[PDB]
Design a protein around this nucleic acid. Structure first.
Ligand SMILES: [Mg+2]
Ligand SMILES: [Mg+2]
Ligand SMILES: [Mg+2]
Ligand SMILES: [Mg+2]
Ligand SMILES: [Mg+2]
Ligand SMILES: [Mg+2]
Ligand SMILES: [Mg+2]
Ligand SMILES: [Mg+2]
Ligand SMILES: [Mg+2]
Ligand SMILES: [Mg+2]
Ligand SMILES: [Mg+2]
Ligand SMILES: [Mg+2]
Ligand SMILES: [Mg+2]
Ligand SMILES: [Mg+2]
Ligand SMILES: [Mg+2]
Ligand SMILES: [Mg+2]
Ligand SMILES: [Mg+2]
Ligand SMILES: [Mg+2]
Ligand SMILES: [Mg+2]
Ligand SMILES: [Mg+2]
Ligand SMILES: [Mg+2]
Ligand SMILES: [Mg+2]
Ligand SMILES: [Mg+2]
Ligand SMILES: [Mg+2]
Ligand SMILES: [Mg+2]
Ligand SMILES: [Mg+2]
Ligand SMILES: [Mg+2]
Ligand SMILES: [Mg+2]
Ligand SMILES: [Mg+2]
Ligand SMILES: [Mg+2]
Ligand SMILES: [Mg+2]
Ligand SMILES: [Mg+2]
Ligand SMILES: [Mg+2]
Ligand SMILES: [Mg+2]
Ligand SMILES: [Mg+2]
Ligand SMILES: [Mg+2]
Ligand SMILES: [Mg+2]
Ligand SMILES: [Mg+2]
Ligand SMILES: [Mg+2]
Ligand SMILES: [Mg+2]
Ligand SMILES: [Mg+2]
Ligand SMILES: [Mg+2]
Ligand SMILES: [Mg+2]
Ligand SMILES: [Mg+2]
Ligand SMILES: [Mg+2]
Ligand SMILES: [Mg+2]
Ligand SMILES: [Mg+2]
Ligand SMILES: [Mg+2]
Ligand SMILES: [Mg+2]
Ligand SMILES: [Mg+2]
Ligand SMILES: [Mg+2]
Ligand SMILES: [Mg+2]
Ligand SMILES: [Mg+2]
Ligand SMILES: [Mg+2]
Ligand SMILES: [Mg+2]
Ligand SMILES: [Mg+2]
Ligand SMILES: [Mg+2]
Ligand SMILES: [Mg+2]
Ligand SMILES: [Mg+2]
Lengths: 94, 77, 46, 58, 103
RNA sequence: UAAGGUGAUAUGAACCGUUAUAACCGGCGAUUUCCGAAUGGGGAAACCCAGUGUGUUUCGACACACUAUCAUUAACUGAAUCCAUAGGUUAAUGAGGCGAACCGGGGGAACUGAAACAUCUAAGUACCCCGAGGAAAAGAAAUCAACCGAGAUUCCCCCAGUAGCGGCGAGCGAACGGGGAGCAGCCCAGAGCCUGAAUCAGUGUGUGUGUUAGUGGAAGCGUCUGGAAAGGCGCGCGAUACAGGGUGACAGCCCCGUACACAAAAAUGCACAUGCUGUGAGCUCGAUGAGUAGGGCGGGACACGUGGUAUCCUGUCUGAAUAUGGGGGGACCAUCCUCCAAGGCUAAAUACUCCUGACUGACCGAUAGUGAACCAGUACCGUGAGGGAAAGGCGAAAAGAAC
RNA sequence: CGAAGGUGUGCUGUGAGGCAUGCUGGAGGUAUCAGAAGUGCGAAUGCUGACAUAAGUAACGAUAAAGCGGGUGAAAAGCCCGCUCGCCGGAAGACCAAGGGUUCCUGUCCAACGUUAAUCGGGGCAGGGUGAGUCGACCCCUAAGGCGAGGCCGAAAGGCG
């Protein structure tokens, strides 16, 4: 059992890319940028409740922030988390 | 450490001085001996790491006298 | 030509690590002398 | 009073839930290039802070 | 606690345009104000693709120190200095000369 | 308190508010992820792995709280061994860690000087460890002094670089007493009478004065040079305000302020009284801190280096009278004088500033001044302790050069 | 109606120096008399910063080797494609564990880097990319070895177990 506050606060944003579009159009899979304390059992529940869409498995990966320079000082971006949510056949969303 | 439970004596520092007044650091140690004292009140022996002066103090005052002082001080016997 | 520095993260953290400097009481003095100086990196732990 | 101290704990919880839903919707809309008014995020976050503080006060 | 506000008529004391009158537009925290058509600068504005800005030389107002301006007393046509008093339990401004409350 | 605001490089977009829940400042509060004394176990710091209990449960399981060690207590069940101890479980209480300097203790050198060097000095200095407090320690005479007397302890100035110690070499260095800051003495070692007495205070309130946001705050014009006036030339005014800073060149009267007069919803410090939980007064009588003082053997501390060396402490061995008694008065004896150790508490003068507020400097002005006036203990070097920089100024206003 | 300072001229005093002024400079300087010094530099293989000399000299980093035809571009021997030559091939090939931490791909750029230029690159900017019940880490168990409840010892710290 998972509360609703966690399901509402776990998701951060969707992800826009050519690979994400190809995955959505050829394998029924969406790409979501989520938080760090997230888990597969929580992402699946959040997608099933908020979006009312069935999910079978979730593939999550962590992204390493890049080190850039704004002028002379150096700065490392935040390490965000990416999740691949595969939708069951027959369900569509955007 | 080499400490008298009764009198509180601990090793001290001094100097070895020869016939030419050469001073070398040295330590003065107590004459500690582990002895078993017979306490009649609890009908059991007790082991105490004391010196000969502590033994004379025990012989002059008594064992129950010293054990009560140890309990007041917080020492374990 | 084998130089003196052959890196190893585990061996580096076992010796020059915060958990090791907490023990070996003279490591607390090392940490204090860096905190008073204002070091940005007290140890090499990442 | 902010018209919320006179309410009940159940009403505050329901307001908490719908404010979180609105915050999630606004975040989803801001992630894509379609949201324009960004002050709503701060407003809803401060309202959530107010209601959560009132819950602790109760 | 401010003697100059965004809806007050003021006259310039010192500068290249002393003696000119106008209405201020805004008040800044750096002790500067913008007055209508007083301190004009021929700024060179470069075009940008965004907003389809064509550019061109633009006449724009410039910031002026508050100490270089003062309230204008239309009752006598002369400049005045602002003070503070209390009326009906509320702080209000008044002129140092002839003691007339600002309306 | 207020008509302007959403911190800076940093402009923008999107908004709030303009007579009072916009922002801002202060007080009281809540949330306060993880590592880190870290405290549920572990650990390559910001990581891993749990148990118990209570609550939810669309049965996928989720949420919260507790669970380290030590010491002092309370209860229960406890072994060798019968009563009884050791030991084990639970609950309550307190700390443990960090910090610039000051302090008291436990340890403790050398380079140097002596023109070498070992006694000595450097020095009980540097450094290590423990402890506690805004001060700490010490503190009420078994003290000095000299037949006259002072009366706790602490700090300053003289006594004095004198008397003294010292391979009498280098060097070390008092005390008596005087003049000053400051000031209060008590309690147990034990019983009885009066009966809750002065009394320290953590105790509860109000009163007064602050501190933590703040209010009012006087008095000027013309002309000239000049990019711009505060400058010059003239005429006026305020001042319990001509301390200071800013504003286009040097402003008492342009602005912020200043002299001065006021203000607290709420917490908090400081002085007084107040039922206030316990204190224990006052009187009579009695007692007077024993393996201690002294002594022997090998050391140290007192200006004092065993020297004729007086005095304090003990590492070891012994070792009394104890009110008719004992200690001290610089080897020691006699007389005389002074004082009652072997149990404790005690503020004020006195030492210091990591940090707060105000003010000042015949202090410095970017190779100076803190290492760092600037995104500095940063970049960088070394595995690591650690070492450690360089670098400031457009213009009054970016009006930062449309084309 | 032009201060300090900078750069020249003239005059003057036995001297260290002083005075006046042209130009740049654009806001402070200071008479006389006294007082206090971080008070005068050519050296110390003095310190910091800058600039010369040797000098446009050596060198441009394994003697495995390159030639040509087209393309983009302001410009090509070095960027792209194609046809030939040569080299390693128990490697000069392909996977990894250590270690490094975006250096991986695309678009774009040519100020600084590449010991030359460069349209190129591990060089600048922006964007994207790392998907595990079966791999590893996590986890069970221990070796050497560390810590170590209590415990023993130790002037404190602490040492052993
Ligand atoms: Mg899968
Ligand atoms: Mg010595
Ligand atoms: Mg802002
Ligand atoms: Mg208010
Ligand atoms: Mg507040
Ligand atoms: Mg833990
Ligand atoms: Mg632990
Ligand atoms: Mg010598
Ligand atoms: Mg000595
Ligand atoms: Mg007498
Ligand atoms: Mg000495
Ligand atoms: Mg005011
Ligand atoms: Mg005023
Ligand atoms: Mg004038
Ligand atoms: Mg100027
Ligand atoms: Mg003795
Ligand atoms: Mg003795
Ligand atoms: Mg003697
Ligand atoms: Mg004596
Ligand atoms: Mg004597
Ligand atoms: Mg004598
Ligand atoms: Mg006595
Ligand atoms: Mg006494
Ligand atoms: Mg400097
Ligand atoms: Mg300079
Ligand atoms: Mg080294
Ligand atoms: Mg000139
Ligand atoms: Mg000068
Ligand atoms: Mg000159
Ligand atoms: Mg000049
Ligand atoms: Mg002068
Ligand atoms: Mg000099
Ligand atoms: Mg020179
Ligand atoms: Mg030189
Ligand atoms: Mg040359
Ligand atoms: Mg050549
Ligand atoms: Mg040559
Ligand atoms: Mg040649
Ligand atoms: Mg050559
Ligand atoms: Mg060559
Ligand atoms: Mg080459
Ligand atoms: Mg070659
Ligand atoms: Mg070609
Ligand atoms: Mg080539
Ligand atoms: Mg071949
Ligand atoms: Mg071969
Ligand atoms: Mg590297
Ligand atoms: Mg890069
Ligand atoms: Mg590449
Ligand atoms: Mg590229
Ligand atoms: Mg070029
Ligand atoms: Mg090049
Ligand atoms: Mg090179
Ligand atoms: Mg690149
Ligand atoms: Mg994975
Ligand atoms: Mg496997
Ligand atoms: Mg083992
Ligand atoms: Mg232990
Ligand atoms: Mg061990």
């Amino acid at each position: 059992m998972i509360r609703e506050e966690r399901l509402l606060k776990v998701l951060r944003a969707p992800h826009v890319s050519e690979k994400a579009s190809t995955a959505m159009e050829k394998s029924n899979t969406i790409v979501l940028k989520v938080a760090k304390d997230a888990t597969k059992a929580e992402i699946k529940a959040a997608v099933q409740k908020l979006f009312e869409v069935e999910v079978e498995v979730v593939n999550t990966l962590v992204v390493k922030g890049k080190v850039k320079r704004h002028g002379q000082r150096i700065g490392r971006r935040s390490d965000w988390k990416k999740a691949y949510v595969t939708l069951k056949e027959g369900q569509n969303l955007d | 450490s080499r400490v008298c439970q009764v009198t509180g004596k601990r090793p001290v520092t001094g100097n070895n001085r020869s016939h030419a007044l050469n001073a070398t650091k040295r330590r003065f140690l107590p004459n500690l001996h582990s002895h078993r004292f017979w306490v009649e009140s609890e009908k059991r022996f007790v082991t105490l790491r004391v010196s000969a002066k502590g033994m004379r103090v025990i012989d002059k005052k008594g064992i129950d006298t010293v054990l009560a002082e140890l309990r007041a001080r917080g020492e374990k016997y | 030509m084998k130089r003196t520095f052959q890196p190893s993260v585990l061996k580096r953290n076992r010796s020059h690590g915060f958990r090791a400097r907490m023990a070996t009481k003279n490591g607390r003095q090392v940490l204090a002398r860096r905190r008073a100086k204002g070091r940005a990196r007290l140890t090499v732990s990442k | 009073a902010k018209e919320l101290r006179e309410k009940s704990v159940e009403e505050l919880n329901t307001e908490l839930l719908n404010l979180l839903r609105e915050q999630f919707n606004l975040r989803m809309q801001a992630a894509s290039g379609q949201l324009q008014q960004s002050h709503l995020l701060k407003q809803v976050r401060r309202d959530v802070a107010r209601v959560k503080t009132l819950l602790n006060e109760k | 606690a401010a003697k100059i506000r965004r809806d007050d008529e003021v006259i310039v004391l010192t500068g290249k345009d002393k003696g000119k009158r106008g209405k201020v537009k805004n008040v800044l925290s750096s002790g500067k104000v913008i007055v209508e058509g007083i301190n004009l600068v021929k700024k060179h504005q470069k075009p940008v693709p965004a907003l389809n800005q064509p550019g061109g030389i633009v006449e724009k107002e410039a910031a002026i120190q508050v100490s270089n301006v003062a309230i204008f007393n239309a009752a006598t046509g002369k400049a005045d200095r602002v003070g503070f008093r209390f009326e009906d339990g509320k702080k209000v401004r008044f002129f140092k000369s002839n003691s007339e409350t600002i309306k």
